[PDB]
Amino acid sequence: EVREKLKRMEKKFDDSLEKAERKIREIIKEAEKKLKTLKKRNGPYEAVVTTLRAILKAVETKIRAIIKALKTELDALIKAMETILKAHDKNDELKKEVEDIIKKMRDKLTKLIRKAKELLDRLKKKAKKVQDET
Amino acid sequence: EEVREKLKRMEKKFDDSLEKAERKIREIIKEAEKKLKTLKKRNGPYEAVVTTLRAILKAVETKIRAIIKALKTELDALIKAMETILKAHDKNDELKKEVEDIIKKMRDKLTKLIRKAKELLDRLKKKAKKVQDET
Numbered sequence: 469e470v471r472e473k474l475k476r477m478e479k480k481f482d483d484s485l486e487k488a489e490r491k492i493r494e495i496i497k498e499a500e501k502k503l504k505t506l507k508k509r510n511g512p513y514e515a516v517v518t519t520l521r522a523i524l525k526a527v528e529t530k531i532r533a534i535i536k537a538l539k540t541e542l543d544a545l546i547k548a549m550e551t552i553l554k555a556h557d558k559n560d561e562l563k564k565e566v567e568d569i570i571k572k573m574r575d576k577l578t579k580l581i582r583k584a585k586e587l588l589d590r591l592k593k594k595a596k597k598v599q600d601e602t
Numbered sequence: 603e604e605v606r607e608k609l610k611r612m613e614k615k616f617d618d619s620l621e622k623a624e625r626k627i628r629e630i631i632k633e634a635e636k637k638l639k640t641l642k643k644r645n646g647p648y649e650a651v652v653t654t655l656r657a658i659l660k661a662v663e664t665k666i667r668a669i670i671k672a673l674k675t676e677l678d679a680l681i682k683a684m685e686t687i688l689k690a691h692d693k694n695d696e697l698k699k700e701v702e703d704i705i706k707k708m709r710d711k712l713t714k715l716i717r718k719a720k721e722l723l724d725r726l727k728k729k730a731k732k733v734q735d736e737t
Contacts, residue, residue, distance in 0.1 A: 477686070512650045515657035518637075522661035526668035533672035537679035544683035547608075548690035555691075 470556050474569060477545050481573050484541055485580055488534050492584045496591055499527050507598050516602040520595055527591065531584055538577055546570055605691050609704060612680050616708050619676055620715055623669050627715075631722050634662045635729060642733050651737045655730050662726060666719050673712060681705055 502523050510516060549566055556562065637658050641651060684701055688694035694701065 511653045511657075514641075514650070514654045518654070518657045518661045522664040526664050529665070529668040529672050530675070533675035537675050540676070540679040540683050541686070544686040548686050551690045 470552060470562065473552055474549060474566065477549065478569050478573065481542065481545055482576070484538060485576055488538055489580055489583065491534060492531055493587065495527060495530050496587045499523055499591055500594065503595060503598055507601065510602060513602050517599060520599055524592060524595055528588065531588060535581060535584060538580070542573060542577055545573065603691065605687060605697075608687055609684060609697075609701065612683060613704055613708065616677065616680055616711070619673060620711055623673055624715055624718065627666055627669060627719050627722065630662055630665050631726050634658055634726055638729050638733050642736065645737075648737060652734060655734060659727060659730055663723060666723060670716060670719065673715070677708060677712060680708070 503520070506516065506519060506523075549570065553559075553562055553566060638655075641654055641658075684705075685694065688697060688701065
């Protein structure tokens with residue numbers, strides 16, 4: 469019972485990580501679509517920069533929220549796993565495998581953070597190319 | 603138990619986000635109202651004024667919706683984190699309606715902020731129409 473509770477919580481975080489990744493990539497794709505149609509129109513200078521900055525700012529706002537959400541859930545998972553162990557009889561085999569689960573989830577989180585920030589940096593580089601046209 | 607403390611701490615966590623979001627939204631609109639006065643003083647061509655006015659209003663609306671979506675994303679995370687806490691210690695059967703009253707309290711604090719955002723944006727759109735008319 470104690471180990472199936474740990475694996476189930478480990479399986480749930482991976483599902484949250486995968487869905488967060490698809491939402492982030494979906495947000496980037498829809499931002500690139502708005503940026504291409506911005507180059508196609510190109511009005512006055514004051515209108516191009518204001519829209520471009522708003523596009524980027526909205527993107528960063530949403531991505532930070534998803535990333536914060538992942539860190540909130542991981543926090544709840546770490547503290548819950550420790551509650552499961554402290555209520556269970558002191559078993560050093562469990563008190564040595566849980567850190568392996570904890571470390572595995574923490575690395576998967578920072579791995580996804582790196583992906584989200586690299587897509588965003590490449591998005592900001594595209595927008596800088598659009599702003600310098602105007 | 604201490605589980606009740608972990609729930610209340612996560613409730614105050616959302617209060618800090620709603621507070622920072624509100625002051626951020628107000629900051630966005632004040633800068634927008636400064637761009638309207640800058641545009642009014644400039645007295646550019648009519649075509650350039652209407653195009654810039656539409657870009658400003660869409661920009662403010664774009665950033666406000668993103669902040670609201672960011673708050674709904676945090677609300678989902680805190681509700682999920684509460685589920686994980688309840689099922690870990692014992693069961694959510696004990697605090698089934700207490701957590702629901704906490705959730706429904708956070709959802710209502712979110713609606714109050716969405717109200718202030720709609721009111722501030724509608725007030726900004728009136729200042730933009732007056733610039734469109736005085737030009």
